[PDB]
Amino acid sequence: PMILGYWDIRGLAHAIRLLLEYTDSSYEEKKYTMGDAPDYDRSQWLNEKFKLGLDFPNLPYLIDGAHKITQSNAILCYIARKHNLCGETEEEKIRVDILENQTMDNHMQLGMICYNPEFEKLKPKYLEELPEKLKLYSEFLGKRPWFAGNKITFVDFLVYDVLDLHRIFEPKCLDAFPNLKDFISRFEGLEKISAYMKSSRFLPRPVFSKMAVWGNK
Amino acid sequence: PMILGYWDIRGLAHAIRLLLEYTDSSYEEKKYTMGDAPDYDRSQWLNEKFKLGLDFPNLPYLIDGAHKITQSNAILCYIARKHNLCGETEEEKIRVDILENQTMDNHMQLGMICYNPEFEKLKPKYLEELPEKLKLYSEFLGKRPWFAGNKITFVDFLVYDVLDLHRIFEPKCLDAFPNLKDFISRFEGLEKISAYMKSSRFLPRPVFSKMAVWGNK
Ligand SMILES: N[C@@H](CCC(=O)N[C@@H](CSc1ccc([N+](=O)[O-])cc1[N+](=O)[O-])C(=O)NCC(=O)O)C(=O)O
Ligand SMILES: N[C@@H](CCC(=O)N[C@@H](CSc1ccc([N+](=O)[O-])cc1[N+](=O)[O-])C(=O)NCC(=O)O)C(=O)O
Numbered sequence A, B: 001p002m003i004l005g006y007w008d009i010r011g012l013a014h015a016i017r018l019l020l021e022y023t024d025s026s027y028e029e030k031k032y033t034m035g036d037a038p039d040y041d042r043s044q045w046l047n048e049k050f051k052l053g054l055d056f057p058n059l060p061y062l063i064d065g066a067h068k069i070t071q072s073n074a075i076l077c078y079i080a081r082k083h084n085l086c087g088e089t090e091e092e093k094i095r096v097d098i099l100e101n102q103t104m105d106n107h108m109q110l111g112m113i114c115y116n117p118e119f120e121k122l123k124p125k126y127l128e129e130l131p132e133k134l135k136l137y138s139e140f141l142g143k144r145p146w147f148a149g150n151k152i153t154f155v156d157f158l159v160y161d162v163l164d165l166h167r168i169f170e171p172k173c174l175d176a177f178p179n180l181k182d183f184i185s186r187f188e189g190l191e192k193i194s195a196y197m198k199s200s201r202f203l204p205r206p207v208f209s210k211m212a213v214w215g216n217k
Helices: A013-022 A073-082 A090-114 A119-141 A154-169 A178-188 A193-199 B013-022 B043-051 B072-081 B090-114 B118-142 B154-171 B178-188 B192-199
Strands: A004-009 A027-032 A061-064 A068-072 B002-007 B027-032 B061-064 B068-069
Touching: A013 A154, A013 A193, A061 A073, A068 A073, A068 B090, A073 A090, A073 A154, A073 B090, A090 A119, A090 A154, A090 B068, A090 B072, A119 A154, A119 A178, A119 B090, A154 B013, A154 B068, A178 B090, B002 B013, B013 B061, B013 B154, B013 B192, B027 B061, B061 B072, B072 B154, B072 B178, B090 B118, B090 B154, B118 B154, B118 B178, B154 B178, B178 B192
Parallel strands: A004 A027, B002 B027
Antiparallel strands: A004 A061, A061 A068, B002 B061, B061 B068
């Protein structure tokens, strides 16, 4: 069975875990524990980091037999390809590519301030800007059932994670975009998704690692 | 003809410009000018940002008729797909995916400190770490003519820009990895590449925008 390595948190592995579940993939998980402050001992991972045969050692990392992979989006396409969720038409592949990177951006943005000691000070501006960000995704999705088009793709998992992370950060954020709310309903309503969410495996928190100022627990 | 919008600098548009050239693509450039300190007036771009019909307004952006694209890596695949440089075999697509993101990481890393006011203080550590970074690419490439494998792909443009930016930042950096040096020789040795470098179009500097503390000019 495949084996997904990551910290004992949600973070970046979220969309992957969801995808793996949606695809009925056979897998295990090698969760790494980070020590408490002030050191935040990472040795559990560092003692293994370069022993796994990974090309660019990192987290998350996926191991499927002889295939060792790093970089979240790389791991997602890998999985998605086995179930034709990496896109089909031309326009689909474009939307996929754009989102694939757009979400990664918007994510690192939140991550950056949530790990910034001055989070409290920065928070005001970030929130002032967020509505427009969400709007973009609303406009983008429009009347489509999924982001790529009529068929679901791995990018839907990425958009979800991002959108979800924001209802958690600011609950009223998605209130102004019905289609987005429906998207979340539609995504969580997915049979294998719904079931996974009610299982013991579902790890929706902590959102970030112990070093984080927000969602660190 | 296609139209590539970006700042009047190298930056993220570099690999794209190189690819476009190597593919003999018919295109123009909409270069945006940033005002001098302390305001760094961006208005030339802001007054157009939401008028272009882009989905997620940003730079660089590519316009091919009805197709409006953002996110550098999104733009690269779009172009590479028209010429079969987006990867073919399974293992090829993996390497492409990994590098497509790996390079983007290593890039932002450099960008972050080069835009950091305390650049001078941060520089010492970054340099202490760089060798291992480069080594990863060397190990990765190994005895292959190209990163993807025997055929050249758009990621080779990404790896080049990164490797190039680092010889500029620290000339002796690549000295310990012959295969990487040969890679640089082999890439610039490409007919259309070589030619483009001797042209008036070649924009290798400034490396970053005016806001940068390094390579700002
Ligand atoms: N581009 C890579 C990024 C991988 C990465 O950064 N992994 C991190 C945790 S994520 C992370 C780490 C720091 C911050 N931060 O804000 O400081 C935010 C996030 N995040 O998940 O957004 C890690 O611990 N890697 C193991 C290692 O480096 O050896 C990918 O998407 O796979
Ligand atoms: N993920 C996107 C990122 C796009 C982006 O960052 N665009 C910047 C320039 S790049 C950039 C900007 C800042 C820093 N920095 O280090 O501070 C590094 C880089 N970089 O290219 O590496 C911009 O000016 N966009 C127009 C807008 O936002 O309206 C992509 O790769 O296309």
